From a paper:
The photoreceptor [name] (AR3) from the archaebacterium [name] is a light-driven proton transporter. Absorption of a photon of appropriate wavelength initiates a highly ordered sequence of conformational changes (the photocycle) which results in the movement of one H+ ion from the cytoplasm to the extracellular medium. AR3, along with many other microbial rhodopsins, has a desensitized, dark-adapted (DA) state which is formed from the resting, light-adapted (LA) state in the absence of light.
In this study, microcrystals of AR3 were prepared for data collection in light and dark environments by sandwiching them between 13 µm thick sheets of polymer film with high X-ray transmittance. The opaque sample mount enabled AR3 desensitization to the DA state, which was maintained and captured at 1.9 Å resolution in the diffraction data. The DA state is characterized by a thermal equilibrium between at least two conformations: one possessing all-trans retinal, in common with the LA state, and one with 13-cis 15-syn retinal. Two different retinal conformers are modelled for each structure and the greatest apparent movement is around the β-ionone ring. All of the major structural features visible in the high-resolution cryo crystal structures were also resolved at room temperature, including the retinylidene chromophore, which is formed from the covalent conjugation of retinal to Lys226, and the conversion of the N-terminal Gln7 to a pyroglutamyl group. Arg92, which is resolved as four rotamers in the two cryo structures, is only resolved in one position in the two room-temperature structures.
Author numbering: 7 to 247
């Protein structure tokens, strides 16, 4: 694979996992330090949710870097590498990102339940795809998972957007900016998966790891940066519980 075998264990992709680890750690510490000087009760909720996003990713990236939770899946002759921690990361962090958006929109607990439920299904069916031993199964689970993603994105772009709008221009502008980012960035994930080692195998494990790393840092640190510098986080929130 494209990269450099940093730890001398036959894995060129550790170059990208190592860089990922550092950027996630730096992002976590940045938000944490900025968080310390925040007193508004609403701002503090946004900081708490948002710090955990690169924080959990940091742990997953460190694990993958050291080769913890790495295994092989047989698809005929081919043995595919699967990093379990990638999926565990996404399981925890995608709901947290959706919670940030739901707090801005100030939607009800049932709406939030639906959003995070379909999101969880997206990730789980992604994992089933990655562990499947035939081509037909892998592509089928990918498609099912992609339909779940579209449902999530549709809810953001319609129901949550309309709710955010009535909270006035500050909240609405921040919501719209973040949703514009999400609609593009999240859609890149299924594309990379199907052209990479898990799908068609046009791109190898090296390039794939690199590009997931860029997506992850943008979707987590980039998202957090835009959110936490907005005045909208001072506005009233109502957590689902
Ligand atoms: C780390 C932060 C984010 C926002 C990660 C997002 C990941 C996805 C949107 C993954 C989606 C997938 C789909 C739709 C199809 C199967 C494979 C994936 C799990 C990568
Ligand atoms: C309170 C407003 C939101 C409640 C919406 C009720 C309908 C629920 C739709 C469920 C969609 C799940 C998709 C499963 C994967 C395709
Ligand atoms: C109102 C529409 C809501 C649902 C949108 C889901 C599809 C997202 C399309 C964005 C495609 C970006 C491709 C970027 C890859 C380089
Ligand atoms: C033999 C040593 C090869 C070293 C290759 C270094 C290439 C540059 C790496 C930059 C990775 C992109 C970081 C993106 C940050 C979001
Ligand atoms: C003024 C802020 C300085 C410290 C910010 C730390 C963030 C480190 C992560 C690298 C940023 C990549 C995010 C991509 C932005 C689109
Ligand atoms: C042979 C040493 C390679 C070290 C890679 C550093 C990457 C800088 C971003
Ligand atoms: C744990 C962090 C690993 C640092 C490696 C950085 C490679 C450029
Ligand atoms: C305060 C830093 C965030 C920690 C997130 C949880 C990962 C450690 C087990
Ligand atoms: C919670 C972070 C996991 C990092 C594992 C380190 C293992 C050292 C060999
Ligand atoms: C072939 C395996 C079928 C999976 C379909 C997922 C809905
Ligand atoms: Ca307030
Ligand atoms: Cl404050
Ligand atoms: Cl307050
Ligand atoms: Cl490669
Ligand atoms: Na290595």
């Amino acid at each position: 694979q494209a990269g450099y075998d940093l730890l001398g264990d036959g894995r060129p992709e550790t170059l990208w996992l190592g860089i990922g680890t550092l950027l996630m750690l730096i992002g976590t510490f940045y938000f944490l330090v900025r968080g310390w000087g925040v007193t508004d009760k609403d701002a503090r909720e946004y900081y708490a949710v948002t710090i955990l996003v690169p924080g959990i990713a940091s742990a997953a990236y460190l694990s993958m870097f050291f080769g913890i939770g790495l295994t092989e899946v047989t698809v005929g002759g081919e043995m595919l590498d699967i990093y379990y921690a990638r999926y565990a990361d996404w399981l925890f962090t995608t709901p947290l990102l959706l919670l940030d958006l739901a707090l801005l929109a100030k939607v009800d607990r049932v709406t939030i339940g639906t959003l995070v439920g379909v999101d969880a299904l997206m990730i789980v069916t992604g994992l089933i795809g990655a562990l499947s031993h035939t081509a037909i199964a892998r592509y089928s689970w990918w498609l099912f998972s992609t339909i779940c993603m579209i449902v999530v994105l549709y809810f953001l772009a319609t129901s949550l957007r309309s709710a955010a709008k009535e909270r006035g221009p500050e909240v609405a502008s921040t919501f719209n900016t973040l949703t514009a980012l999400v609609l593009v960035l999240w859609t890149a994930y299924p594309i990379l998966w199907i052209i990479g080692t898990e799908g068609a195998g046009v791109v190898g494990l090296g390039i794939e790891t690199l590009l997931f790393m860029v997506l992850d840092v943008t979707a987590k640190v980039g998202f957090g940066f835009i959110l936490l510098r907005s005045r909208a986080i001072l506005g009233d929130t109502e957590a689902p519980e």
